[PDB]
Amino acid sequence: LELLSDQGYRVDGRRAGELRKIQARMGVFAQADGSAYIEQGNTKALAVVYGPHEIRGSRARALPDRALVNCQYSSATFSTGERKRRPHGDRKSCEMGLQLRQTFEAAILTQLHPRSQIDIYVQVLQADGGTYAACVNAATLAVLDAGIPMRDFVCACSAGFVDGTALADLSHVEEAAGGPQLALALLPASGQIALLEMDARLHEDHLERVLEAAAQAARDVHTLLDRVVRQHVREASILLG
Amino acid sequence: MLQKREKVLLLRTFQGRTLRIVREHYLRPCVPCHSPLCPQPAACSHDGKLLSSDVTHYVIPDWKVVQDYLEILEFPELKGIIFMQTACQAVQHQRGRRQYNKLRNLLKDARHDCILFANEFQQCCYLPRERGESMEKWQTRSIYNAAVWYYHHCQDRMPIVMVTEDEEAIQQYGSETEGVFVITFKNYLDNFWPDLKAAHELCDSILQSRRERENESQESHGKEYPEHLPLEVLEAGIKSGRYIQGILNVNKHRAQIEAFVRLDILIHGMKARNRSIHGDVVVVELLPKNEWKGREPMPTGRVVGILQKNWRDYVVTFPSKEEVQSQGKNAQKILVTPWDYRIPKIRISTQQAETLQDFRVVVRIDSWESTSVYPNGHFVRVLGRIGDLE
Amino acid sequence: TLSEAEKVYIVHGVQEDLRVDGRGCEDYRCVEVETDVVSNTSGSARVKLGHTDILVGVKAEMGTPKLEKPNEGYLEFFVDCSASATPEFEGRGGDDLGTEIANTLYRIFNNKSSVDLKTLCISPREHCWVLYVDVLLLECGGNLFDAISIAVKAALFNTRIPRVRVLEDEEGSKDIELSDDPYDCIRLSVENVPCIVTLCKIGYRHVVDATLQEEACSLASLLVSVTSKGVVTCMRKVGKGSLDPESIFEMMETGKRVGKVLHASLQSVVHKEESLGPKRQKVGFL
Amino acid sequence: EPASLSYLSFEGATKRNRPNVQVGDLIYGQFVVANKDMEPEMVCIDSCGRANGMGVIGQDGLLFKVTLGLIRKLLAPDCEIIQEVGKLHPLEIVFGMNGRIWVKAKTIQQTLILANILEACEHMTSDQRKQIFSRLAES
Amino acid sequence: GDHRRIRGPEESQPPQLYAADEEEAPGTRDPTRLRPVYARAGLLSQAKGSAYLEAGGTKVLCAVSGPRQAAALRGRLLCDFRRAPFAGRRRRAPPGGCEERELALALQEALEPAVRLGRYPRAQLEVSALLLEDGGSALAAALTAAALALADAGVEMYDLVVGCGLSLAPGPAPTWLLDPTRLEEERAAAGLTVALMPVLNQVAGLLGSGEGGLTESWAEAVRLGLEGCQRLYPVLQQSLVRAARRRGAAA
Amino acid sequence: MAMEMRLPVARKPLSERLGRDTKKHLVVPGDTITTDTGFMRGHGTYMGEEKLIASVAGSVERVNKLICVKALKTRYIGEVGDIVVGRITEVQQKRWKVETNSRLDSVLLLSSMNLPGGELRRRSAEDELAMRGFLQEGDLISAEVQAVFSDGAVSLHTRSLKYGKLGQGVLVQVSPSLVKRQKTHFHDLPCGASVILGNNGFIWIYPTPEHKGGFIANLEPVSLADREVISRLRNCIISLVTQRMMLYDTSILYCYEASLPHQIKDILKPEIMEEIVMETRQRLLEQEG
Amino acid sequence: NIIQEEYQEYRQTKGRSLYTLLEEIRDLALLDVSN
Amino acid sequence: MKETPLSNCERRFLLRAIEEKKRLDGRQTYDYRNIRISFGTDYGCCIVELGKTRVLGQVSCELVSPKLNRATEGILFFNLELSQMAAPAFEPGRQSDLLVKLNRLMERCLRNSKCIDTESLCVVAGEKVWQIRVDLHLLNHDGNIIDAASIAAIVALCHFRRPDVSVQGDEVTLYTPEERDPVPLSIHHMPICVSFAFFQQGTYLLVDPNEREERVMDGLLVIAMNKHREICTIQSSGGIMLLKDQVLRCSKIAGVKVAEITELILKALENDQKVRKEGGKFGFAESIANQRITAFKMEKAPIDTSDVEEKAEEIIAEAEPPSEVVSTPVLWTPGTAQIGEGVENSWGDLEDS
């Protein structure tokens, strides 16, 4: 099957260094302390956060120096072509909630809420392509909506490598083809990387170009989400006064 | 810039499971048209293979004229060809890999006037299906609209000639845009290119072999081999005395025709050989002397079932590079060539074909299936290297 | 929880046909039902009765008939309880509520005339259609039973069930062949799908569509399952206090009348949404 | 079980001039109640009341752990281990009967070497072995 | 499979699905009759309170544990329903089942309106019920027995709980029946079980689902269920009397 | 009775219904705020390398050396001498625990409480047994913050006559940023009811105490003419709080009068709020202006 | 070229190293010089 | 119970060291703690010791039916495990957020690299195929569990030897080491993990850290890369915030280290095969150091089995025979019978009525 034509067009019609269309939203729910909604291409995510509160259970599991970040991951049973129902014991959810907890224990400026918990929930309504970056961006928007201070605006994007060229924002068809996939979590102002992942084989000479293309695609996600945040804050500033 | 749309699909897996997979599609403003009269260079900049305007016309098959008549469109006298990507996609998803590789070599060549057009990635030539349809009608509609768009982008200067083998496209489409015709192929040739009479005999050849084509393809239905049956039948058919049974061998100069049944019964044909290999014990009826053949009329037979079932474990080879890079790069199915002329080719599924093209390997056989012309197998173990005595 | 004085004020108000919102002893807050929200599924709904939020999905798949009857299909429910609804719903903890709702839905739909079962069988003893109803709790704001029993009738009305004409003959292609048409489907005749009616009891008066505060002041409640025609399917009493025989008879009439109005108005609203088709766009979660 | 100090157990400590003791610091002190009926309790100055080196110790050294045998062997009146080991590298030690030792050499390299080579002195019997061993490590 | 039990065959199809004897015909009866019932209280010796209820083909054993450590200002009432695997037509998975959890909740939401938990602060009561044989209405036996056990365990209650059961005939003129059996329950269309307090005259629990859709049959099903719970009371009246007469005289 | 079931309507963005341009300075996390020679960081910002970097979305507010960012959604932060309303969630041996929409729990010490008797008789350990009896779980109080602890905790006291356990009424919880700072948070609105504007976002509405601490129960029925006033104020408060409105005495009084023409039951529609909030907006415009 | 540049940089330490000696010390402390 | 806490003097000393570029145990920055492998007697069993860590690897195969789809391959389980004896903290169900990241690292490396040849492990299709099952256990925790676990899994998989079968026509047969010789496996490449630790916000790094150095570090970087020059997984984790030159430097370092480790592994497997083929003695027993105080060996011993008959005989003869009061069973009514002291009446009746 052709994943890159001779003309340079992909299966869905975009070039190598081209992203899908994103359409976000802030303030979806009312009861919670924060909310967000993003649809990156054909993947629909959702995130809900709860502000610093009293530790549930009160089983002396607190930290006297910082706060306790608690991230979960879930997925709807109609999120793909087949039903594929799973119980709440899978290790895919555990590893996704652990990479989420790892990146948000580094992005959030947590040394201001001693002996407090932060509960972050992510719900995926339709998965087609990169799920990690869609969850990270939806929870970055939900955290901004909740007013929790943070060092920067963390954004994530993936990449690939086919026929000696570097792709960007891979889809499920391209992902399920046995290629060197790769994902980041970038802080645009400093250029630092919060998380790095990889699978499948790849030569050592092509790591610089796949990593550079992924970082550039994350910097391209940054501008599009930045205009959404600026329009939202100008909206509320106009409403307030 | 781009404009998202969707495409549903109905994929049928090998186990009988269909699914409504949904997928993406991204339109663009400016699809390059690879022409020397595009009235704005920069917007695409035409960075590829580019025609030179000397021709009288331009002919675009709709989908079929390149599906089967392709063997015509190689003659270096033909000039001014443009392929609609929807036809290329049709042939790829309908004609396997050989025709597609020939077409793509044709395209990827600086000898002819062949280019390719992104009909489906251009923002006003794409059209969605409607209530009551078929791939053929949607196909011709899309090709037509693509033609019209290419014409109007050309500023009505170079006369496009849409060739079809559809008659109803002739009867309706070809009468409502001045400067573009929907004519049959032989009319195209006659009307334009007389001194190409060579193409005329080959086109008449393939059209008479076409009237055949439907007759041979509809006198074949949906069965390839006589289906087998139980053993107690063969017990009886032996005892009652209407079934002999012996060993079976094959010639090796002629190994698709000359199969013998050592009591010698001449088996002629694959459809007569009925999915069976040498060294086997098969039960066979006789046949009437009015349908016997020559090497006098000899007692040819008919095999319905195999009592006792003798296999072996062969030594085969892998195809060649320039025909693997086209298999994809994750090519599940593959074809293997045995080492003695007496054995058919075997269908197996592996994922290392691009790094074992200098080694002998070993395979086996699990099941001969009739919806395939070949028997199935599975890799077994590696062997030595082609070139060294070992 | 709420203090004793607040509970006294609320119970006194209900007896005077006044409530903190301002409605009466029988008023019903509006809802924002919608359909065709999810892509990958074969039918969707989204019911918003207030602070609550529901989202369901129905997918029809190939399957095998059960042993007791060969000319039938079956229905599969799975009431998920997402952890975004409440922090106390983290991981384990939403299992008992989800099982309670799934069992209630099974009791509701466990009847021969629920929708149909002949239509979902194609070849006896060999094949059948299966339906997966997947409820997803997004928020909890009281009256959770009815906000789901409405989104189920709504989503069931929007099914597709793509038609298959494959011949079962052995000589022919027994393997399931579809119609190859991406837009060829069939409706489901959901006219008489039942719905749940809740009746909280405060003082000696019964109240429909009680809020969380009005639910915390109640001791018992009754559930009635009524179709559009006005017939009862399931009847379960839930609570922590006695109810008395009389209140059963005087709650049954209110269940009948509210059910009839709910069904007629739901038929009208779905027909209004359907009268104009691909126009009007679709808006949800954005 | 963990032990238990008191804020006034230190030298010259009252309700106002409490001592600065953080979480995660090492203290030199002796026990006064160690029966198997309660959590052990230790005071930290003296019998009379003048803290003789007790209290919080350790600012630029390394704390490692050894078995009870080496501690028993070193705390002997006929033990020449410390004198010969200190001949090579000048040192100062504060032993602990729970199996812990605090060392402070001049160079960090020397503190690493003393830390590694002291855990092995319970074994590797003296004479035929210890002098040659000392010469090899002299370097 | 399970690492805390003895593993046997992975799959096992019972011979009922291969049983070549066709389903028989139940028969007919008078719908104004009750199966004779024998009740015994104070059975177990190591339990604070116990009772054994048997009527026709039903055998259920219930035991009550005393208050233990751990809406406070009030005590909890834990419940646990479990039936023996060698009960019914087929075997059942030991780990559990959704039906058992449904009957456990139908027990908890029916025995709390009787006991007064405002006398056991920070304490809790645990009730365990076991069904040795399923030969008819089961939830009409897990309520009577678990209520007899509580009264015999010396806990303070407002009143007892007496249960009943009904089923609907499948004929063209359906009629509700009292105390159905498995031959009259697997051929039925709907069933109803009521929990009536005989003295306070207050319904404690209600449960019913099926094919009966006219709101004039359920009025009769409810009120004949109440007449059944008013007719089962005297036997339970003499059972606790005999239980206390024997328990007291042993001192 | 008709059980209206409407359909969702697309939201109109940009707040084009009136039209205004902001003259403020707006930032988002990661933006570099003014980086002059010497400045002091406020709440909402942090420092990197010779840079004042905003850490939360909002608008910068400076008073003469101080760069800080004011977010538009936060939780309550305690300050000395601030009127709060809370609920008891834990009763301990020597304290209660009160939830007031803060990052932690708030502690009400037994030493600061107007115990029953309301005078100087005695205070000893005999009261400790019955202290956990009257201020039980889930009660409502209204106290004043005393001091700030070392980990953001707040201690609140009830050493007055207007503070103590509350009685009947309704409670409305909103975000703690729509309440305008004033000097009198206790009000006696001339409508038939009263109100307490808790600085933490808790709004308590109760009837006027007829003539003239939880000592009085007064668990007797409340007249019909009082409930309709409480329901009207409840709905009007919801209406103003929803779109933008900051809550205080004049806005609620203005909206209450504007709500007389039509019924209390029918005001739940998206448009009736708009036609009431705009009328209150113009009444404030024609009064202040 | 580059393979030998980083060769001389990131080798295992050559020969007589401290780690060698301290492991010698460990296995000479647990030895047995009487059999 | 929990693990001893970390003081505030060791942290200062370790960081002063790291600043000064000198480590506790003497080894410089780009070094490993030397390795020592030992082979069992039956194939696919080894004990690797990196520094003072121990891992036990054991491979084992079995013949099953190959699911549905993928009818011409075999499956490959894995199961890491942490033994309660490895360290105080490890508790059977209280360390569930290290097991996951470890199993994942191991599985992504070993199963996505495609080094094992699961193509040629079929006998028929749709019918019985071999199901291998790797198993690792941690015995002693001293830091860098994953390098040791990876080397252990590699050696255990490169030392296994399957059973072997005859297939011709449509008929099966299963041999045994005396009927037919066990057969090796096919291993494409050798994916070997490497770990890096970062200290005080990426300013310094240290290769192959042990357990104290693991508690004074910010975050960890792992780079799994088979022989030649081909990377197979990377997973940044911990608390780190990285640059772009550093990933490349790390990749170089991992290249070098995997080269050296594969050298060592190949040499050790070769030596082991030579020993097994010469005809000498092998196994866990003939590996115990004899030059050491804590080892002792004892050859066989007949003890004296000359007396047991007499003692048993006299014991049987010298004790009291079974007595002869025989009890009677009582019959009440078919179905129930009682034995013992019995009950006075036949059965109770109208006792209280």
Curated annotation (Swiss-Prot), chain A:
Query: Where is the protein situated, by its record's location annotation?
Result: Cytoplasm; Nucleus, Nucleolus; Nucleus; Nucleus, Nucleoplasm
User: Pfam families under this entry?
Assistant: RNase_PH, RNase_PH_C
Q: Provide the transmembrane region boundaries.
A: none
What the entry lists under InterPro entries is as follows: ExoRNase_PH_dom1, ExoRNase_PH_dom2, ExoRNase_PH_dom2_sf, PNPase/RNase_PH_dom_sf, Ribosomal_Su5_D2-typ_SF, RNase_PH
Instruction: Recite the UniProt keywords alphabetically.
Output: Acetylation, Cytoplasm, Exosome, Nucleus, RNA-binding, rRNA processing
The principal location of this protein is cytoplasm
Please name every pair of cysteines joined by a disulfide bond in this record. none
A biological process (GO) of this protein is: positive regulation of cell growth
Task performed by this protein: Non-catalytic component of the RNA exosome complex which has 3'->5' exoribonuclease activity and participates in a multitude of cellular RNA processing and degradation events. In the nucleus, the RNA exosome complex is involved in proper maturation of stable RNA species such as rRNA, snRNA and snoRNA, in the elimination of RNA processing by-products and non-coding 'pervasive' transcripts, such as antisense RNA species and promoter-upstream transcripts (PROMPTs), and of mRNAs with processing defects, thereby limiting or excluding their export to the cytoplasm.
PANTHER family listed in its UniProt record: EXOSOME COMPLEX COMPONENT, EXOSOME COMPLEX COMPONENT RRP41
Recorded family membership: Belongs to the RNase PH family.
Name listed for the protein in its UniProt record: Exosome complex component RRP41
Q: Which gene encodes it?
A: EXOSC4
Swiss-Prot record, chain B:
What does the UniProt entry say about where the protein is found? Cytoplasm
Residue intervals of the CSD2 domain: 334-390
CSD1 domain location is 236-295
**Its job:** Catalytic component of the RNA exosome complex which has 3'->5' exoribonuclease activity and participates in a multitude of cellular RNA processing and degradation events. In the cytoplasm, the RNA exosome complex is involved in general mRNA turnover and specifically degrades inherently unstable mRNAs containing AU-rich elements (AREs) within their 3' untranslated regions, and in RNA surveillance pathways, preventing translation of aberrant mRNAs. It seems to be involved in degradation of histone mRNA.
Subunit: Component of the RNA exosome complex. The catalytically inactive RNA exosome core (Exo-9) complex is believed to associate with catalytic subunits EXOSC10, and DIS3 or DIS3L in cytoplasmic- and nuclear-specific RNA exosome complex forms.
Family per record: Belongs to the RNR ribonuclease family.
Tell me what this protein is called: DIS3-like exonuclease 1
Source species taxonomy: Eukaryota, Metazoa, Chordata, Craniata, Vertebrata
Full-protein residues shown here are 1 to 421 of 1054
Curated annotation (Swiss-Prot), chain C:
Output this protein's name. Exosome complex component RRP42
Q: Does the keyword tRNA-binding apply?
A: no
Highest rank taxon of the organism: Eukaryota
- One record GO biological process: U1 snRNA 3'-end processing
Q: Which Gene3D superfamilies match?
A: GHMP Kinase, N-terminal domain
Q: Does the keyword Transferase apply?
A: no
Gene Ontology cellular-component annotations: cytoplasmic exosome (RNase complex); cytosol; exosome (RNase complex); nuclear exosome (RNase complex); nucleolar exosome (RNase complex); nucleolus; nucleoplasm; nucleus
**Do you know which SUPFAM superfamilies this protein is assigned to?**
Ribonuclease PH domain 2-like, Ribosomal protein S5 domain 2-like
Q: What is the lineage of its organism?
A: Eukaryota, Metazoa, Chordata, Craniata, Vertebrata
Per the similarity annotation, which family is this? Belongs to the RNase PH family.
Post-translational modification N6-acetyllysine, affected residues: K112
Quaternary context: Component of the RNA exosome core complex (Exo-9), composed of EXOSC1, EXOSC2, EXOSC3, EXOSC4, EXOSC5, EXOSC6, EXOSC7, EXOSC8 and EXOSC9; within the complex interacts with EXOSC2 and EXOSC4. The catalytically inactive RNA exosome core complex (Exo-9) associates with the catalytic subunit EXOSC10/RRP6. Exo-9 may associate with DIS3 to form the nucleolar exosome complex, or DIS3L to form the cytoplasmic exosome complex. Exo-9 is formed by a hexameric base ring consisting of the heterodimers EXOSC4-EXOSC9, EXOSC5-EXOSC8 and EXOSC6-EXOSC7, and a cap ring consisting of EXOSC1, EXOSC2 and EXOSC3.
Q: Where in the cell is it found?
A: Nucleus, Nucleolus; Cytoplasm; Nucleus
Q: Which GO terms describe its molecular function?
A: 3'-5'-RNA exonuclease activity; mRNA 3'-UTR AU-rich region binding; RNA binding
What keywords appear on the UniProt entry? Acetylation, Cytoplasm, Exosome, Nucleus, Phosphoprotein, RNA-binding, rRNA processing
Residues bearing Phosphoserine? S173
Q: Which cysteines are joined by disulfide bonds?
A: none
Q: Which CDD domains has this protein been placed in?
A: RNase_PH_RRP42
From Swiss-Prot, chain D:
What processes in GO biological process is this protein linked to? Answer: CUT catabolic process; DNA deamination; exonucleolytic trimming to generate mature 3'-end of 5.8S rRNA from tricistronic rRNA transcript (SSU-rRNA, 5.8S rRNA, LSU-rRNA); isotype switching; mRNA catabolic process; nuclear polyadenylation-dependent rRNA catabolic process; nuclear-transcribed mRNA catabolic process; poly(A)-dependent snoRNA 3'-end processing
Q: Where is this cross-link: Glycyl lysine isopeptide (Lys-Gly) (interchain with G-Cter in SUMO2)?
A: K15
Q: Which domain of life is it from?
A: Eukaryota
Gene Ontology cellular component terms for the protein in this record: cytoplasm; cytoplasmic exosome (RNase complex); cytosol; euchromatin; exosome (RNase complex); nuclear exosome (RNase complex); nucleolar exosome (RNase complex); nucleolus
| Disulfide pairings | none
Q: Name one GO molecular function term.
A: 3'-5'-RNA exonuclease activity
Q: Could you tell me the keywords of this UniProt record?
A: Acetylation, Cytoplasm, Disease variant, Exosome, Isopeptide bond, Neurodegeneration, Nucleus, RNA-binding, rRNA processing, Ubl conjugation
Subcellular localization: Cytoplasm; Nucleus, Nucleolus; Nucleus
Which coarse location class describes where this protein primarily resides? cytoplasm
Involvement in disease: Pontocerebellar hypoplasia 1B: A severe autosomal recessive neurologic disorder characterized by a combination of cerebellar and spinal motor neuron degeneration beginning at birth. There is diffuse muscle weakness, progressive microcephaly, global developmental delay, and brainstem involvement.
What's this protein's family per the entry? Belongs to the RRP40 family.
Protein name from the UniProt record: Exosome complex component RRP40
